[PDB]
């Protein structure tokens, strides 16, 4: 089982630097080359770096020319993106990725396996923890049907937040609606999980709210209000 | 650079149906071509390499055909679950690797009218002076839906936001939320909310409304 695990993007000042790590389980590290390749928001893949498998041989895209540096140490399994002189449009998911066949050149230019990806965010904005708030059912109807109920998760700063029902208990008919940047620059999302009518009063329902980047951990409890 | 092209850059394809997809180079990259697949919040996956090499665990209804400048991607049998961006890339240019900018398949399954729910603020919130009014709309198709808020039968504009759930990977359905957000004092001022929602499904618009107090 190829597992590729990135760390260390954040939220970083304009011209600033940051140092992404990939950890590596599962194969032969020093048999494959590797790469770094990003996301902006909302936008295509763009390849940045790719290092041989030695470690001798190291390439850029010429939008990262001269501002990044990709190493690794395949004595313990890690590949590393230094950045620096970070610009907004550096902002994006970087995603570390293993070249497909072992070998060089001419079995190169694949990537087979990818990481779940660490997010940079280039901005002198603060860093400001959500407020959770609940999205309680009420008048549900027939005591047969399907009731809908929620977290409303405002006013935080950067992305992302991860929303789990029941510490990960509840998932089906959930659904976590992306992100969305208010008039203030702050986002703000909700998360919805429609239930069986008849279990409200017999099931707790409490939603949990990780906002990493800024160590905000809430677990809030929905239920159904007086009158 | 080589610049790949994917164009048209959606496409909606019925269930069960074959689905063709297009990349364009503007030079030859020989068969140095490869497919991924990108679902929602996820890594992309490789499916194709070589133009025509299906990528280990690719089912065969997977199929990369094409050579120099054109290339297809067809699925066959397509499946609620193959709903992603879709990214041919060129590695003739070893290593200037460049990619198209993607196509994104939508499934196009039948019509399925939303389910309406409208959630007052909650009165944690009310203290802090903010009102964060949330209407729902699960499970629907297609994608195109209205939603309007009145306040004590007054329509509301610029002061409400939509978010949209990206297409379902099992049931091929997306859900919304409008969020209305006044001042505590301008919540405090109007009786009646009420959410107003227009689709295709519904023969005649569903209004979801409380009242402030009660």
């Known amino acids: 089982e190829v597992q590729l695990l990135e760390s260390g993007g954040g939220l970083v000042q304009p011209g600033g630097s940051l140092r992404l790590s990939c950890a590596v389980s599962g194969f032969t590290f020093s048999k494959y080359a590797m790469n770094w390749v990003r996301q902006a928001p909302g936008k295509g893949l763009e390849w940045v770096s790719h290092?041989?498998?030695?470690?001798?041989?190291?390439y850029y895209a010429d939008s990262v020319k001269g501002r990044f540096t990709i190493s690794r140490d395949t004595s313990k399994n890690m590949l590393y993106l230094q950045m620096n002189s970070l610009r907004a449009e550096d902002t994006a998911i970087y995603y570390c990725?293993?070249?497909?066949?072992?070998?060089?050149?001419?079995?190169?230019?694949?990537?087979?396996?990818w990481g779940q990806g660490t997010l940079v965010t280039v901005s002198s904005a603060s860093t400001k923890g959500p407020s959770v708030f609940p999205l309680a059912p009420s008048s549900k109807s027939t005591s047969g049907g399907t009731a809908a109920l929620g977290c409303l998760v405002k006013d935080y700063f950067p992305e992302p937040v991860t929303v789990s029902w029941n510490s990960g208990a509840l998932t089906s008919g959930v659904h976590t609606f992306p992100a969305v940047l208010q008039s203030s620059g702050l986002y703000s999302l909700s998360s919805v999980v429609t239930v069986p009518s008849s279990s409200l009063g017999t099931q707790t329902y409490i939603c949990n709210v990780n906002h990493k980047p800024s160590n905000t951990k809430v677990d809030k409890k929905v239920e159904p209000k007086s009158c | 650079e080589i610049v790949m092209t994917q164009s048209p850059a959606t496409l909606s394809v019925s269930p069960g149906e074959r689905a063709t997809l297009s990349c364009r180079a503007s030079?030859?990259?020989?068969?140095?071509l490869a497919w991924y697949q990108q679902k929602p919040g996820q890594a992309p996956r490789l499916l194709i390499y070589?133009?025509?090499t299906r990528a280990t665990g690719i089912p065969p209804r997977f199929s990369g055909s094409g050579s120099g400048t054109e290339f297809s991607l067809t699925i066959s049998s397509l499946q609620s679950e193959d709903f992603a961006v879709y990214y041919c890339?060129?590695?003739?240019?070893?290593?200037?690797?460049?990619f198209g900018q993607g196509t994104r398949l939508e499934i196009k399954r039948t019509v399925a009218a939303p389910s309406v729910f409208i959630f007052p603020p909650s009165d944690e919130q009310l203290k802090s002076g903010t009102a964060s009014v949330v209407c729902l709309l699960n499970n629907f198709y297609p994608r195109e839906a209205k939603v309007q808020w009145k306040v004590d039968n007054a329509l509301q504009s610029g002061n409400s936001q939509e978010s949209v759930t990206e297409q379902d990977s099992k049931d091929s359905t997306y859900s919304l939320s409008s969020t209305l957000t006044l001042s505590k004092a301008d919540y405090e001022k109007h009786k009646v909310y009420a959410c107003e929602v227009t689709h295709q499904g519904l023969s005649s618009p569903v209004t979801k409304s409380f009242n402030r107090g009660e």
């Open positions: 990725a293993k070249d497909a066949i072992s070998g060089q050149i001419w079995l190169q230019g694949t990537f087979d396996y």
């Open positions: 290092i041989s498998g030695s470690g001798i041989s190291t």
């Open positions: 070589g133009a025509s």
């Open positions: 030079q030859s990259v020989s068969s140095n």
């Open positions: 890339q060129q590695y003739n240019n070893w290593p200037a690797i460049t």
